[PDB]
């Protein structure tokens, strides 16, 4: 009997090496821990959330500290278009003399690493200019990380541990978080913007010593108490304005010009100032909605039980759903992860087209890395959302609690939903692959005019509805006689139209038949991932092959070779197979983004337009042409700065290959091999004296799927990140 799995007494009784792996894997599965109630579980989750907050704040404090220490933030401030950002210095004793000489980029002395995280543009936009301010930010963020540490320890002692009902208070939690965590937080952010970033972009240094002596607007809060709010939007920054000086600038703190800055190719500071102010006001207003100790407010259970449509449209409607969401933590986790992943996808799709940071659009590799990072994060988070929804369905779903409601009715015709998802996925894949293979074999025969080029009329029609006059559709917001163009004609239309009719920026790029085909491939990937995740969630508790899946836990290997074979029958394996489809889908979207933007930056958009139709052109002009500088990182002739990216490329290849090692072969042959190794160690001289305390045992089937998926994913991420940053940094 060991004591490493203190949460699981049964795991401590395991005499094999499986105990270590299972204790590490079931580290934060508090619902399966031995002798644990609901209230202690909620308190443990509260402390864990405090721990993740402290970790996040410590990590960003370290980012500030390393940028202020070894970066070139002052040199970047003086020249953003020329000087490259620096993340951290490189001190590797295994480096050679050419290796040190090949990493002193950005006008530095020692070996440094070029920063593509975007923090330089972000901190230059929000008024941070010197490394002193970054140092102060780092020490303050470390201080608040320590504060969150102490608070997480604070809510674990007696007379301070919150009760179970305190966590289940839904209306007051939503009221407080929507009012303060969103509303007054955005109000503080737009106050910081107006006080610091707006004058710092106009050559007026605002710091802690003089922000009480300087004034943000020359009228000085008289518009705010009075009604004359248009005095703030009176003298905005002109087109010939520099983000560092006050050359041709104006005195405006809140304005809605729209579009982009003509110099920095980014959204106006007053635009985001009024944006965050309006968001703050709307969220504070919306935060006064749910019912609290006072007599006014809204009750969530009342709204859920009241919204039951007549004539049995949704059966019982949302009746009995408040207790289902409140009692099940996995339901709330799945909803939160779904919204977080969807909004991370939204952030990725809105950052590149509407850059909010000065000189971010000029930094091509930084934008590519940011988009790829947040898209892969969003995909993983959506996969986790569906997995935790499946966990809700099997673990803490009570059908008699909500009988005839939307949840039970959805579970009733789950076969119809799964079958229709399978139909749309099969149809999309069939015809997308058919047209891709058709166009590719047509281009092979020397006759590229025979390929099927279906023009994306719908999205071009939408773009023309937004003011893009390239396609010639004289719809609303593109014609002067439409009411939508006239409404806002003097507010933000001359900025938005100028920004959307310029093809140099990334705002609403022109799209051809190859764009539409890869969009359909993206839809295919989304549909198939949704199909498998939905099928795993709905069949998590029951199936015709196995009606009692809810009794076997969420993550169990199989049921055996009987009944034909039940391999990968759990919803955990459904998630595990869905991660491959998620990786493929985000790979498709990032391939599309990277190739279209690379052809835009190089200037040959026609190459992408005529080459993205067929898959051979995709391969040759994306995975082969752009990989020339990547694999030349360390030639036998010599080494350059891209040697780290080529090594990371081959590293990701090797880790993906080891993922294949864990994925193809299954446990049962490895057990006999380990048994032969056990006999070898036990029956040899000079080594039988040294004996294991944990019995060597091959990796479990669920563990095998986890480690194969893990190796596959990290190898995938590393090789694609290496290729992306090497192809975007080799030329620009």
């Amino acid at each position: 009997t060991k004591l490493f799995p203190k949460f699981s007494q049964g795991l401590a009784q395991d005499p094999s090496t499986r105990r270590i792996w299972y204790g590490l894997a079931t580290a934060h599965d508090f619902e399966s821990h031995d002798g644990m109630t609901e209230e202690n579980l909620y308190q443990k989750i509260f402390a864990s959330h405090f721990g993740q907050l402290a970790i996040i704040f410590l990590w960003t404090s370290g980012n500030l500290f390393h940028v202020a220490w070894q970066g070139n933030f002052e040199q970047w401030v003086t020249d953003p278009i020329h000087v490259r950002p620096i993340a951290h210095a490189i001190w590797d004793p295994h480096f050679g003399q050419p290796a040190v000489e090949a990493f002193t980029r950005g006008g530095a002395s020692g070996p440094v690493n070029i920063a593509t995280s975007g923090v330089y543009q972000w901190w230059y936009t929000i008024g941070l200019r010197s490394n002193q301010e970054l140092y102060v930010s780092s020490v303050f963020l470390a201080l608040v990380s320590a504060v969150f540490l102490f608070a997480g320890w604070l809510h674990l002692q007696p007379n301070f541990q919150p009760s179970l009902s305190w966590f289940k208070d839904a209306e007051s939690r939503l009221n407080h978080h929507l009012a303060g965590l969103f509303g007054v937080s955005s109000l503080a952010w737009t106050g910081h913007l107006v006080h610091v970033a707006i004058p710092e972009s106009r050559g007026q240094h605002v710091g802690w010593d003089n922000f009480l002596s300087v004034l943000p607007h020359p009228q000085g809060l008289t518009p705010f108490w009075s009604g004359n709010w248009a005095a703030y939007a009176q003298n905005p920054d002109t087109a010939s304005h520099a983000f560092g000086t006050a050359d041709g600038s104006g005195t405006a703190i809140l304005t809605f010009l729209g579009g982009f800055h003509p110099q920095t190719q980014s959204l106006w500071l007053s635009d985001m100032a009024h944006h965050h102010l309006a968001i703050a006001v709307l969220f504070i207003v919306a935060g006064h909605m749910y019912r609290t100790n006072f007599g006014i407010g809204h009750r969530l259970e009342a709204i859920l039980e009241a919204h039951t449509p007549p004539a049995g449209g949704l059966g019982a409607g949302h009746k009995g759903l408040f207790h289902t969401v409140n009692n099940s933590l996995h339901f709330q986790l799945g909803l939160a992860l779904a919204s977080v992943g969807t909004i991370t996808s939204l952030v990725a799709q809105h950052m590149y087209s509407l850059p909010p940071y000065a000189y971010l659009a000029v930094d091509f590799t930084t934008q590519a890395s940011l988009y790829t990072h947040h898209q892969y994060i969003a995909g993983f988070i959506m996969c986790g959302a569906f997995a935790h929804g499946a966990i809700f369905f099997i673990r803490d779903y009570d059908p008699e609690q909500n009988k005839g409601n939307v949840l039970a009715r959805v579970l009733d015709h789950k076969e119809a939903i799964i079958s229709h998802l399978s139909w749309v996925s099969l149809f999309l894949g069939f015809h997308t692959l058919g047209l891709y293979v058709h166009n590719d074999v047509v281009q092979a025969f020397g006759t590229p005019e025979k390929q099927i080029l279906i023009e994306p009329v719908f999205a071009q029609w939408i773009q023309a509805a937004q003011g893009k006059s390239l396609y010639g559709f004289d719809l609303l917001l593109a014609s002067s006689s439409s009411p939508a163009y006239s409404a806002g004609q003097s507010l933000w239309l001359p900025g938005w139209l100028e920004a959307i009719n310029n093809n140099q920026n990334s705002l609403f790029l022109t799209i051809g038949p190859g764009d539409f085909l890869v969009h359909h491939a993206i839809a295919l990937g989304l549909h198939t991932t949704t199909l498998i995740l939905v099928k795993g969630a709905l069949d998590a508790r029951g199936s015709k092959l196995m009606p009692d899946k809810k009794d076997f836990g969420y993550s169990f290997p199989c049921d055996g070779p009987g009944r034909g074979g039940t391999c990968d029958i759990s919803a955990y394996d459904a998630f595990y197979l869905a991660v491959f489809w998620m990786l493929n889908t985000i790979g498709w979207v990032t391939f599309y983004w990277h190739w279209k933007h690379l052809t835009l930056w190089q200037g040959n958009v026609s190459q992408f337009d005529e080459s993205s139709t067929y898959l051979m052109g995709w391969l040759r002009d994306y995975l082969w042409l752009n990989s020339s500088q990547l694999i030349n990182g360390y030639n036998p002739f010599g080494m350059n700065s891209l040697s780290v990216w080529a090594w990371t490329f081959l590293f990701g290849h090797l880790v993906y290959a080891t993922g294949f090692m864990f994925l193809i072969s299954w446990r049962g042959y490895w057990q006999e091999l380990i048994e032969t190794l056990v006999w070898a160690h036990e029956k040899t001289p000079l080594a039988n004296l040294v004996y294991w305390k944990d019995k060597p045992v091959a990796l479990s089937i669920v563990q095998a799927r986890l480690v194969g998926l893990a190796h596959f994913s990290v190898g995938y991420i590393f090789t694609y990140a290496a290729f992306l940053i090497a192809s975007t940094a080799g030329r620009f």
């Binding site: 004591l3 270590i20 140092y135």
Partner: protein, 41 residues
């Protein structure tokens, strides 16, 4: 210094700190974890 009071680390700090967390801290981690796992009640 001109407001170096948010203390700037020395220019020789990597030579001490990189091997400290690359060689010593992993060693303490392995030793502590191996004492943890092989602990009988």
């Amino acid at each position: 210094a001109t407001e170096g009071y948010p203390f700037v680390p020395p220019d020789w700090a990597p030579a001490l700190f990189v091997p400290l967390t690359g060689l010593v801290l992993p060693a303490v981690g392995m030793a502590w974890a191996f004492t943890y796992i092989q602990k009988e009640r």
